[PDB]
């Protein structure tokens, strides 16, 4: 179920949001896999950080991350979100979103092609697929 209903929160910030839209365009059709971008964080599983994270935006990002109900995952898309990217040495840029929120999959690129983002989604689903939920409780 978790892989089949893959609902992100869109949180699009810059040039990476355009490849994130092209994922949903006809050619790749994220919807065919079960991905619906949902505006509210309340109805979302995944946050995709797609864009340069500034110091002005860091509290807002952490706030939207906090308001997602569990279980929740985060994918960091693009060089800017991975490591601060082309503005790594700027005075108003967070050098990577993993300073702010825990991250599960890092998608490299500037911008990652739509196929690279879909590959990152497949990696997240592979991580979901190997997760122990009730087996972990049995180990307790």
């Amino acid at each position: 179920a978790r892989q089949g209903s893959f609902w992100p929160v869109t949180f699009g910030l810059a040039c990476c949001a355009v490849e994130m839209m092209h994922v949903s365009a006809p050619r790749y059709d994220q919807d065919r896999l079960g991905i619906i971008f949902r505006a509210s964080p309340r109805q979302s599983d995944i946050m995709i950080v797609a864009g340069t994270l500034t110091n002005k935006m860091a509290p807002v990002l952490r706030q939207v991350y906090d308001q997602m109900p569990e279980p929740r995952w985060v994918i960091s898309m693009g060089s800017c979100a991975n490591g601060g990217g082309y503005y790594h040495f700027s005075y108003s840029v967070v050098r990577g979103c993993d300073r702010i929120v825990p991250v599960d999959v890092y998608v490299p690129g500037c911008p990652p092609t739509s196929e690279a983002l879909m590959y990152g989604v497949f990696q997240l689903q592979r991580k979901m697929r190997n997760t122990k939920i009730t087996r972990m409780w049995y180990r307790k």
């Binding site: 810059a14 040039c15 490849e19 006809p26 500037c110 092609t113």
Partner: protein, 310 residues
């Protein structure tokens, strides 16, 4: 800007390529703006139809530059690489059907009375206030003033090609939509003309003190190897001075004010982004409207917000 400071000339073929790709870029930008606008008002389908055309053009970007979005292809002196061998035919093949792809969006949008309900007399801007507020592009041509940098300050091969300039009269969201929709057609015309008239010759300025030499020289010739080394380690030095250079970017007038101190690194670079002036004029335009009208207004300003804050 940098070539104007450098006092160098782009070859003819390079100029033509920059014009073709400037109009492919205009088509892509207008597809994104119009379809995002219609998605904001609620028309979700043109988004997807136009995104397939966007995909087709990003194939051309990737073929000439190697990246779908951030090409880094157009460089002071010309373009980084010559066109691949089978590109003109593919562009022409796409151009034979883009006309229909436009007609279908127009079928859904131009005459729909709900569309006209969401756009007619919304975000009205007068000619004089357009000039006063610093608006440019469609945001200014919608108010009746025929100003277009491609016609006024003919740059690149915009003087070798034939095209018209649409000008509105009411300065509301609907006129700007009509303007953008006709700029689609004019861009298709220019692309075809450049497909028919692409000349031969170099694509970058032929002085290896500005642009790097071809790799077959760089590996055989001493002078070329020195110039390659220096260009990629120190960079060329720009004569001191300053310039403000503006073009007719798809969103309006885009300009840069670069200050050169004679060295290899700019002393100052300020980018004039049309979205900055538009969003500044938002509070004047949107006063007295309803919240959905504010959404439609943001749509017609066509903001990207990389431009707004740099």
């Amino acid at each position: 800007a940098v070539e104007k400071l450098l006092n160098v000339e782009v070859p003819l073929r390079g100029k033509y390529i920059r014009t073709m790709f400037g109009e492919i870029t205009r088509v892509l930008n207008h597809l994104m703006s119009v379809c995002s606008h219609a998605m904001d008002v609620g028309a979700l389908t043109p988004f997807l139809w136009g995104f397939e055309e966007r995909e087709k053009l990003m194939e051309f970007y990737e073929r000439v530059s190697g990246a779908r979005l951030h090409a880094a292809y157009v460089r002071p002196g010309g373009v980084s690489q010559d066109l691949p061998a089978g590109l003109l035919d593919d562009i022409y093949m796409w151009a034979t059907q883009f006309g229909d792809r436009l007609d279908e969006i127009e079928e859904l949008l131009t005459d729909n009375r709900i569309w006209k309900l969401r756009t007619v007399n919304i975000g009205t801007v007068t000619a004089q206030d357009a000039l006063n507020l610093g608006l440019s592009g469609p945001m200014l041509r919608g108010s009746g003033i025929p100003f277009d940098i491609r016609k006024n300050a003919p740059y690149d091969a915009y003087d070798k090609v034939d095209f018209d300039v649409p000008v509105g009269m009411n300065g509301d969201c609907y006129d700007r939509y009509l303007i953008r929709m006709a700029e689609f057609r004019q861009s298709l015309r220019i692309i075809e003309q450049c497909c028919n008239d692409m000349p031969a010759g170099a694509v970058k300025v032929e002085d290896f003190k500005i642009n790097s030499p071809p790799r077959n020289l760089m590996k055989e010739d001493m002078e070329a190897l020195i110039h390659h080394f220096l260009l990629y380690t120190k960079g060329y030095s720009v004569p001191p001075g300053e310039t403000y250079t503006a073009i007719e970017a798809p969103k309006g007038e885009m300009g840069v004010y670069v200050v050169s101190d004679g060295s290899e690194r700019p002393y100052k670079c300020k980018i004039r982004a049309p979205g900055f002036a538009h969003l500044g004029a938002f509070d004047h335009i949107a006063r007295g409207h309803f919240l959905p009208d504010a959404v439609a207004i943001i749509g017609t300003m066509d903001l990207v917000f990389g431009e707004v804050d740099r």
